[PDB]
Structure formats: structure tokens, C-alpha cells
Structure 1
């Protein structure tokens, strides 16, 4: 199945979807009539092939001269998030689901673009320094201007946790120069190991009913959860608890036996981790209605994640903020103020109980589940929409 969760990052109206299309052919759709013209809310999904010519996009070597057929390397799946500074929660969720990143910078649009920088920062925070950098709108720029842009980018990427991350000049519309990108996908991104015995944990980003308009109820379908595994091969025929729960104010975890564990385009026996998977469960498709299973944790039955509202956070912050042009000073965190705490996939609205030296105690208005220590990206409301302040770990 899908071997490595590779994410796509860039500015809004630059062409992440376009890039995906160029790579795979699989469309992110762009939907709900708002997003048909403009920008997606959900993650965009695509399945790209790597079968190398060693003597590729398709498993045949008729194209690159030598008739010695395309030698199977990998199959990779995309994690394409919204690159808008309003919808950052989704991006954050994607980030602690990904194994590696793909940057997208346009030629004619500037080098210190705010959103892109923010994305980069997020990636750095959430252990995602494996970034393949792509020059995108180069089918517009001069023989000198492009070079200048590249130089500027290089200059920028000197103090960042990205040091010598590779840059490729592609056209997402004209279909050129993606060979290099493909090569890098095997070269610069090795897949981090993901075993059998590391306790099975599924991180849900999407809720899906496949209940088509027109059918009869004597021919029914269950609930499908679109979520990623980063530990534990889920096999067909297992019982599950989804632990952030269902709301009564108290919450109670949801129990579902596996109908299917579906990856690629064809349903499989297994779901080997480091991939984003559509899990058919006996759970109602009415709870998989639109975007209900977003930021929920799934464990195999006989397991104890903990649903915390009162949290011990170890926090770290910036000197100067991101999301804006206008990079504003980080004023100190203020008590009993609504922050957004992004933990793996959750985007919970939290109130500050205490501020110490490097630790903070937080109240959650919506309960999140901590199994391990859990990776956090933090966010705040200063300029209406949510800006990225810093990062944390749950000290548990």
C-alpha cells in the first residue's frame, strides 16, 4: 500500500492541487461550490507511483529508451492541506500525520511570503525537515529573475532547521522537470521505520458516508473513517474504540468493529503504517456525515488512551510571530484567554490556567486524548483569525 505520508505545502492560489495533478493525475476535486472556484476545506488526496528506470509514473519502460521494464520502488500517498491563514487547523492536523514535506514557491510572487513561512515553521516544529522545495510558477519568469529568486530563497534557508533541502524548478501545468522530484522522493526522503509491535494508533482526519442518494435501505453501507496510522498494522476483523468520545457536560468514547481497512484503490487484508487509510467500521454513516470524525483518536480494543481537559503543557515560543506580512512582536501569553492547541489532529480551544517559566496549565473546552507525550503546535487570536505563536508538549 501507501508507503510514506508525504505532505504538500505552499501559499494560497499558487497550485498545490495543480502540482498534485501533475505528479499523479488524481484530482483533489476542489468542491462544495465555494471551493470549486476558490479553496478546499478538506485534505486533497492522490496516489503516486515510483517504479524506477535503472537499466516512473507508469510501470512500463517503453518511454525512456531501454525496453527493460520499470523496476518497482514504492507507492506514495499525498497529504495536501489548505494553505490559507484562516484554515490552518487542517494544516496542523496534516502535519502530525505526515512523515515528510514538499514545499511550493511561485516565481513571480515574493520570497518572504507569510503563509509559506508559517508552514515552514510548523514543519520545523513537528519534525518534518525532509522538505523537497519546488519552484512552481517559473513558466512566467525571466532567465535572471528566477535565478535571483532562487538565490534569495537560499539566503533565507540558512538559519532555519532546513539546511540543504533540494530545490527543483517545475511546471505543474506544462508537465516538465518532475523527473528530478521523483528521484529525490527516493533520494532525499528515506522512509522512517514503522514496525509491528509499536502499539496500534489511528489518527482520524476525515469522516465519510458512502450512502449514495437514490439507493434502498435493504442495500446499506456503514461508516468509513479517513485516517492515518503511524504505529501498528491494523488487520481485517478487529474491534476499535474512538476515544475523544460522544457528547452528552461529559463525553463517552465510541465503539466500532472493522467492516474494512481500505487503502490505494483496492481494499486490503492489512493496513501497514506510514499511510492514510479509509477504514470501514460498523459505526453509523450518520456520524460519518460530513466532518465529524476530524481530529479523533482510534485504538484497537483493550487499550487505554486518556481523555484530558486539564493539561500540563511544556511550552516554547517565538520572538516575533508568523501568518502576517508586519511580523508582530510576541507579547507574553495572557491568562484565561482562548488559544487554539493543535495536538496531533485536534484543534481544541483552550483557556490558560497558569503561566510559569517554560510550563503552562491549560483548560480544554473540548477534550483531547493523550496516549504518549503528544506533539503540539500552538495558536492565538490577535488579528481576528488564528496566528501561530509557538509549540508545546504534554508533560504526561
Structure 2
């Protein structure tokens, strides 16, 4: 069917993220077909939980002539912080809403900064509330400021699409302003490339279990997160101990014996010449030379509030929690940012971590911070260091 693209609105409080999300669904419904959604339905976001965190997020769907979008919009700045760090969402692109009446504000900068830390790949801007400002000189200056802010965080500010519009008058039915929503939807379609499919990425399978089987073989089980493993191909077993090479001599699903395992399937992968005791929890299977084992990384983390079931007590530079990467806990030590010495429940910070065992990782890998098997925080690898 139609390509599916994950997007969302980001930007400072009251700059109009919700009004825009409802305008997009409404204008697109009236122009290309679908269901309009009103302000009040999106603004009243439900709660959701995963990785052990609670976030208020509205999920909306809309279509352009050629694509289908799943769009996320959230009530407060804290919701955005939580969603960006985990991957409740996992935006292929974001719409940064900047009210022309205020220019960029503190949360404008923070959402861009986090977008980069967490690897949001593209940002398009909707310069909202242009029905309140006549002055073209002022609109031009606001645009220049946003482009500069974007480039400070490494986004291509000079080449970023910026639409001048009014989410409110578009929502209200003013054709001239509705046309700017259609321009925005055009940039979602032309500026965000079709996302790479998991199936097209290098093979990767987090090992969930291991069995010594029949003849002499060890089988490792897990879900194919990415790519495809074919019988006869070589694999690296990466993480925890020194990388090993092996060959897939079999792929099975229940009683079905297959010639390959593909993205999204739960399989058992038969490994040649590896004994059960060479397999450790936390290891992954990967296409060789495609992911490396690391111990040290920079991350952005959100620490759960007491209320969300997180710690009730703050932590300091000596904190030595477990970092749960895909399938298992790995203890690590932390390094706190400049200034900081106390991290309160409910806080989000950049944290440098050193694990005691290497984990196959690349930027964007998510993790849970655990304490005696209880989730107390959530993070994303922003930069692998060694």
C-alpha cells in the first residue's frame, strides 16, 4: 500500500502544535479524503506506557495523495522529553512549530537539541500565527533566527522548509490559510525521504535464548530486528565477550524449517561450531562488520519520578545502576554533566556511561536503567565513545 511515515509536532508551549495537528487532519481530509480531527480530541491526549514510563501522547493519522502518516502530538514539554528519549514515537521527521508572535523560545531550542541527540533525521518548520503579524521584516527575522538555531544543532537550517501560516485560520476554514497547510503536507511528502525498511537494513537478531539440540548443534532464538539471515551465510556473535564468527546452518519457526529468517519473525537460528557455553545473555547475531561492541557512550536519559515507580531518592556521580540493552542488564558507572552533582527523580540529563561488559550498539539504541530488575530510567545512546 501507501508508504507509512512517522511524524510529529515539536516546539514550545502554546506555539500551536495541537491547532496545527487538527488543521492538518482537517485540511487533508477535505482535500484528499480521510477523517478530520478537532482540536479538543487531540489536545485531550490519552496516557500510554512502555519501557516503564508514562507519557501523554495523541496519535493521529492522515494521508497525502501518496503517503500515510502516523503523527504524534503531546500536551506538555515533559511528554516530549519522555517520548523523544524512549521512542514511544520514533519520528522519521518532525514539524517544528514556532509562533511568529514570539519567535523561538526555550522549548524551541530544547526540542531541537533533543531531536539531534536522539537522531530525529529531518525537521520542517511551520511558522505559525502569521495571521497575528503583518510585518514581513519581522517574519523574515524570525525565520533567520530559526534557521540559525537549527544549524547550531547541526540540522541543515539554510535548506529547511519553512511555511508561514495560521493553524487557527486554517482550522477555521479560511481557504487562503488552508493552502499553507497543503504546502506543509507537500514538504512532509517531498522533504522527508521514504524511511529505510527494517528488511533492507543489515541483519541483526538479539539472542533471547539458546538450546543445545539434536545432533551437535546450538540454536539461538530471537526476533529478527533487521535484514535477513539466509542459510549458508556467516554471522558475527557480538557483545559481552570477544566477537566470534559462525555460520547459519538452519533457520526454523516452530516445526517449519526455513531457508531464511526475515525482519519481524521470531526464529531459531542454527549455528555451526559454536557450543552453548560460548553464548552469553545480551549478545546479538549480526551481519559481519556491521555493528561493533562498545562499553562507553554518551546518552540522554530520563529518570522516572517516584510517582511513576522510579527511585524515591536522588543519585550522584557514584551511581552504578544496571543498563538493560535489548535483553539483559549490564552494570555501568556514570559521569554527570558539567554543573550537575545531584539527579532528582523526574529529571532528564545527558549521561556518559561505561558498562562493565561490551554491548553491540550504534547511536539511537534504546536502553532501560534498572535497579534490582526494576526500571528506574530510560535512555538512548546519543554517541558511542569506545
Greater fraction of residues in helix:
2
